[PDB]
Subunit: 230 residues, 5 copies
């Protein structure tokens, strides 16, 4: 447990843990300065960074001990936080007339995506490409729903700050989340060892997690602020 200056994975575990901890405090402590109608979207942004702060604490210590970070262990957090992130689409479009049907659809797709991903990574690596494909289809459905589907139509109808927030969240989902499917292909045996594979993603995962989770919440927080100051 002596620290080394060249351990960049180590460094990014320490930073990521501290940034998520601070983000969780910022969202929980800000909630009361807003009208009740915004509070839930902010609270959930804080839950997302709270789960990640606590799991990053454990992973940071484990890396200090063993100098390993098994990818399957990252799913402890992803299986909870990715559905919560998908629920934020419902929370920000509820005013624009989203119905619980939307919430259930998103929760279902996100959970299928993460559980099939875990089966590919941990339970049945023989059939990792097949599990990948099931995960990939759930991802594609989520992307289609928010870029073109009902969620997009609701955002467009609302216009204003909401539409703006919606569009930014859609970029985070399209571009920010793409690192995870890529690392899956890099780390699992399949037909994609030719292209990817043998790539160290730990630094990318540690920085990506923080940007993905804190960025999502800052966009939601920014929406509450814009709306309130009008």
């Amino acid at each position: 447990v002596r620290l080394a200056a060249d351990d960049y994975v180590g460094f990014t575990f320490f930073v990521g843990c501290m940034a998520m901890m601070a983000a969780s405090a910022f969202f929980f402590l800000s909630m009361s300065s807003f009208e009740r109608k915004w509070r839930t979207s902010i609270l959930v942004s804080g839950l997302i960074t709270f789960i990640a702060a606590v799991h990053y604490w454990y992973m940071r210590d484990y890396w200090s001990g063993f100098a390993e970070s098994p990818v399957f262990f990252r799913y402890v957090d992803w299986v909870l936080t990715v559905p919560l992130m998908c629920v934020e689409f419902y929370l920000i479009l509820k005013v624009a007339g989203a119905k619980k049907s939307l919430m259930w659809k998103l929760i279902f797709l996100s959970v299928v995506m993460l559980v099939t991903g875990y089966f590919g990574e941990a339970v049945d690596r023989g059939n990792a490409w097949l599990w990948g494909l099931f995960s990939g289809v759930a991802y594609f459905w989520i992307v289609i729903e928010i870029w073109f589907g009902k969620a997009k139509k609701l955002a467009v109808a609302a216009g204003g700050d909401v539409l703006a927030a919606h569009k930014t969240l859609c970029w985070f989902v399209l571009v920010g989340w793409a690192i995870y499917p890529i690392g899956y292909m890099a780390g699992t045996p399949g037909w994609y060892d030719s292209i990817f594979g043998g790539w160290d993603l730990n630094v990318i995962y540690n920085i990506g997690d923080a940007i993905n989770k804190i960025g999502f919440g800052l966009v939601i927080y920014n929406l509450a602020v814009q709306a309130t100051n009008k």
Copy 2:
């Protein structure tokens, strides 16, 4: 204490701990966005997940050490959380005219159920079937009370969101709680060759606890939300 990808019991202890921790924060931090009349029901939903989060933390570490999870140690949480869950029937029917008599009845039955279950599991395994039977009868009385008894009549009279919440809670008690008596029969010596093989009761306990406890609370939280927005 390296993590292994095939340790599914391990994985479900880490997930269950994080989900209960997050649920506790969600209910505690939501309480203030509601009129005083709902806050106690929500507070108690948070107490239920808080006790479970803290006990799941200990059990998760113990499994990391010894790769054992003795059933009797789960009763540390059940003896506190199952009575609190039974109290939620009183809290949601208090408006409909439930009297403390109902609260005391439910607390008494739930406590008898859990303590007789612990005597069967830990103190007197020779007579596990007899202790089972006493627990079984307490369970049956609770089920009859909420499906057909006074509590059901109060719910029906109130109608509306309350009746809806009541019925959902009755399904959780009937179907969601059935895993516990089944695991008891699977694990104890008696007249019962409850052979539910292929699945590790530990995985079922870890997933079932989270669903049972967070599900109960989300139904109560949903009732506060429905009522408030009317």
Copy 3:
């Protein structure tokens, strides 16, 4: 530090710690749903279970390590919580016209009781009967004050919910607190060789503490609720 199913002392340390922790959260989180005039009585009920939760955490660990629970170590909590419980008589009768004189009397007697008890148990066991007797007399004075003295007269004048609460608290002090003088006589050398056999003092301490501390607070909480509802 493997758990054993027959370690009932172990079990009751785990339960007592969790119950106190939950009770502390319940009283601290309830405080704000009450008019200012009730909040202090509730806050102090929470302090009582908070001190006990944290000390039960240490005692639980120590029992896991050494399988010993020295009685003198329980006094770490009792010297703080028993005076706080005695202050609750002042807080609930302040409306009925109790004066700080009463508060100081109760604090003084409770502190004398606990400190003389500790001298008998830990510093001067040669003269345990004498220290016992000094503690005994302080106990008797407290009992006489609340059952017959000024405090009783104030309660009786107030009538209503207050008198009801006062009488229940008087039973907890008379009957619930009797286990402590009994265990003292059971554990110390003197003119008393009280057998009180069959049952492990540690189990009785662990269950008695939780009932004594949470019961006291639930009676104070019940008084605030009754009063608020009218």
Copy 4:
């Protein structure tokens, strides 16, 4: 790590830690029941006991390990808490027309007192009497300021609850704080090693800290209560 019944220093570390922890909770959780104008004085009372609770936790564990409590290590808390206590004179006299000049004077004297004391105790024990003397003079100036100086005149002009609180705080500073200079003379080599040298102050420090810190805050809390209730 086993506890001994005759370890009175040990016992007083456990009690002191628990009492400061409970006091911190009491002041932080009471703050919201008061008009804004009192909240800062109460918050600072909680900071004082919060710092001490956390440092008492470390010193308690260190004593369990090594059975030593080096006096210089107590200064970790004193260098922060003694200036905060001195600021409380400004906070309670701000209404009576105290100016920031007074705050800065008290902060400066308190910090000089504690830092010169630390130099005498830890960095330059050869000249402990000289450092003593510098600390001694800063103490005397503080005492003169509050008993006779401007601060006293402000209190006297205000009259009422303020004057009462001021006088009680002046007794705590004069008599309650005298233990610290005495222990310095008892523990340092100088011209005073005959009179005071060779005295075990650990029990006195542990009890005195708790009484000094919780006492100061209870006087401030009592001032807020008196003022509010009329």
Copy 5:
């Protein structure tokens, strides 16, 4: 891991950790006593000391173990806190008409400064002078912006308490932050091994961090207080 009276680095780690912890509690608990328009600037002052408290806890323990404090490890906190400090210029000038452009500029410069500094210190020490120079230029740009640039013009236009706060913060940036570039030159190989090099900065870092972070926040808190009191 016995404590030594001559370990001044050790002492300052313990003090710094406690002071940051106390400052965090002071800012988080004060937030609610202010109109909404000030609360964010105070919350962020608390995040700054919260990150530092938690990182100082880890560094304190590591020094207890190994008696080393690698400079690169301090960047775990600096990469988060220095940008938050720069955002405070935006938060205090938002009323005077600062635009998000200013926020982004400051965040960008602060992050470049800290990341280039870390490259010089940890990844590429061969070219530490060059990385130094890039960091140095980002620093100079920040200084020019706040002393002469747009931010200064906004402050000057606002006048009053804001201008006063602005000027104080500009001194902290100019003089209080200068210790960090100096320590960099003292610790790295370059052309400045003649001027600096061979200097122990640990005591200076530990005291400077506390003064820099708590000082910044006390100036922001002072601005909210002055403004509130009209």
